[PDB]
Amino acid sequence: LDGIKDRVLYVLKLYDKIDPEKLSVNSHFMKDLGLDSLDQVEIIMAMEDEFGFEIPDIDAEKLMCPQEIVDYIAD
């Protein structure tokens, strides 16, 4: 259950246009990181490749929280 957060944290910092040590689970891609709308899209996609599950077009819109992403991936 945390293992998901372990993978999700690894994916966010690897792209390197985000989380320069400011990575936080409560941190929101759009709300505080400032990462672009599109960049988020890239992120969700990224998570999909490591998880091995492709999340739908819409639910990407609701999760801007890594922690919430782990919430959904566990489901």
Binding site: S37, L38, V41, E42, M45, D57, I58, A60, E61
Partner: peptide, 12 residues
């Protein structure tokens, strides 16, 4: 915008 993004996914 939704569609714009979807295309963004496809192109990515």
């Amino acid at each position: 915008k939704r569609r714009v993004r979807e295309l963004y996914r496809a192109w990515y």
